[PDB]
Structure 1
Amino acid sequence: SMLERTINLYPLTNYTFGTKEPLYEKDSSVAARFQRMREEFDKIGMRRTVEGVLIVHEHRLPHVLLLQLGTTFFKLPGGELNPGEDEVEGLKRLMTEILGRQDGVLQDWVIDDCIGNWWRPNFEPPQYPYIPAHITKPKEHKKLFLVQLQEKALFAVPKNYKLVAAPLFELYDNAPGYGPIISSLPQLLSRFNFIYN
């Protein structure tokens, strides 16, 4: 009886958060977001997204790194795969596009664990951790992965975003604040054996 995955965590003060130019969303509104999902579904089928969960600690208290757009939405680092693109290579590409350095030194992203799977049945906000009853053509499949960080790193945060460290207690039972995927991270992370370096 030791069946848990062992993960190294480092202090938040081990990481440098630099700045770079703004990164703009492909969609200028909720309505434009669901119009483009409908157009691409007709051309290339189900949307495939990938998201990274990056963990740090301070004084042995785990925190998840979240992207905050101005003072509005919280999001995980991630995005949309291209057709025929590998999911793990894709997440590594997207995390470099978002947080990768202005001096063009490469982060060594380490991805070895699936956290979870969510499905969007319609061109509407609702997402579920399973394909709902009667749904044969889901509109989006989202995959979450645990990203093991190095001991130290410099991240370049686009100037229209803040990288924030959220403690697990603040996420727990807080779907109104964070939505159904981020608010269930405490439950999804509980299986790991974290080492507080």
Structure 2
Amino acid sequence: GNKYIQQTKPLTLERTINLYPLTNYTFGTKEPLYEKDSSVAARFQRMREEFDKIGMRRTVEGVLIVHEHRLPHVLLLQLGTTFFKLPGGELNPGEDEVEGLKRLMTEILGRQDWVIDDCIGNWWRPNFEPPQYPYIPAHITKPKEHKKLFLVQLQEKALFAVPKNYKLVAAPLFELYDNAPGYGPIISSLPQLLSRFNFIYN
């Protein structure tokens, strides 16, 4: 004759994420962090050299979200007038994805004095060329890079240490949406990839 109290709905169906105000977050400076590749030519030469040695490049990137006036903003690292990146980078062979992303974000943003429970997408680079796709194209059996994106939940407050040559910016979703010319195909589709989340604006 008993009834059961119903379980919290699956996190697959409704995923809630706490956001905090932009003003909860601050940065201090650290020494500059220079890009591994000094040009487009060097980038693709290194990708080719490493592909021959260790196979497909495995990149991981973190999407950290804050709000201002109840609108989500994604944290980006500005390196040039039109050059923005997510905090992340290249995994070492054998390295766990999530543990690697933790290492990489400590390297880039780690204060000098991470909660990663959510995969938000995957992108693949079929050739030693710029184009990347959110799927493996037909008959591509050996992509040259696989990029995996994760949502990194921030604490209520945090201090970041930012390499001097980077500017830590908070981009509102309307800045990113349908703005591949400004931010590229991955960052510009973050609004779509974040749309399923139930955000709490603390």
TM-score tier by shorter-chain length is: over 0.9
TM-superposed CA distance for 1:132, in Å, is 0.6
* Structure 1 residue 113 corresponds to structure 2 residue 118: yes
* Structure 1 residue 191 corresponds to structure 2 residue 196: yes
- Paired with 2:154 and 2:93, the residues of 1 have a C-alpha distance of 28
Kept in 1: contact 2:82–2:182 (CA 8 A): no
TM-superposed CA distance for 1:28, in Å, is 0.7
Report the CA distance shift for 1:138/1:165 in structure 2 as closer, same or farther (over 3 A): same
Report the CA distance shift for 1:108/1:91 in structure 2 as closer, same or farther (over 3 A): farther
* Overall identity of the aligned pairs, in %: 99
Which whole-Å deviations, capped at 9, do the CAs of 1:90-139 have from their partners, x for residues lacking one?
000000000112xxxxx990000000000000000000000111211100
TM-superposed CA distance for 1:46, in Å, is 0.4
- Paired with 1:38 and 1:164, the residues of 2 have a C-alpha distance of 32
Kept in 2: contact 1:50–1:87 (CA 8 A): yes
| Length-normalised TM-score, structure 2 | 0.92
- Paired with 2:94 and 2:163, the residues of 1 have a C-alpha distance of 28
Report the CA distance shift for 1:96/1:49 in structure 2 as closer, same or farther (over 3 A): same
Give structure 2 stretches of 5+ with no counterpart. Answer: 1-11
- Paired with 2:13 and 2:127, the residues of 1 have a C-alpha distance of 38
Residue 177 of structure 1 is matched in structure 2 by 182
Quick check: which has more Rg, 1 or 2?
2
Kept in 1: contact 2:82–2:183 (CA 8 A): no
- Give the superposed CA RMSD: 1.5
| Structure 1 counterpart SS, 2:131 | coil
Which 10-residue stretch deviates more, 131-140 or 143-152? 131-140
Kept in 2: contact 1:70–1:160 (CA 8 A): no
- Paired with 1:142 and 1:42, the residues of 2 have a C-alpha distance of 18
- Paired with 1:95 and 1:108, the residues of 2 have a C-alpha distance of 16
Report the CA distance shift for 1:56/1:108 in structure 2 as closer, same or farther (over 3 A): farther
- Paired with 2:141 and 2:171, the residues of 1 have a C-alpha distance of 36
- Paired with 1:70 and 1:140, the residues of 2 have a C-alpha distance of 24
- Paired with 2:120 and 2:138, the residues of 1 have a C-alpha distance of 23
Which whole-Å deviations, capped at 9, do the CAs of 1:25-83 have from their partners, x for residues lacking one?
11111100000000000001000000000000011111000000043411100000000
Kept in 2: contact 1:50–1:79 (CA 8 A): yes
Runs of 4+ in 1 over 2 A off after TM superposition: none
Kept in 1: contact 2:32–2:165 (CA 8 A): yes
- Paired with 1:23 and 1:154, the residues of 2 have a C-alpha distance of 18
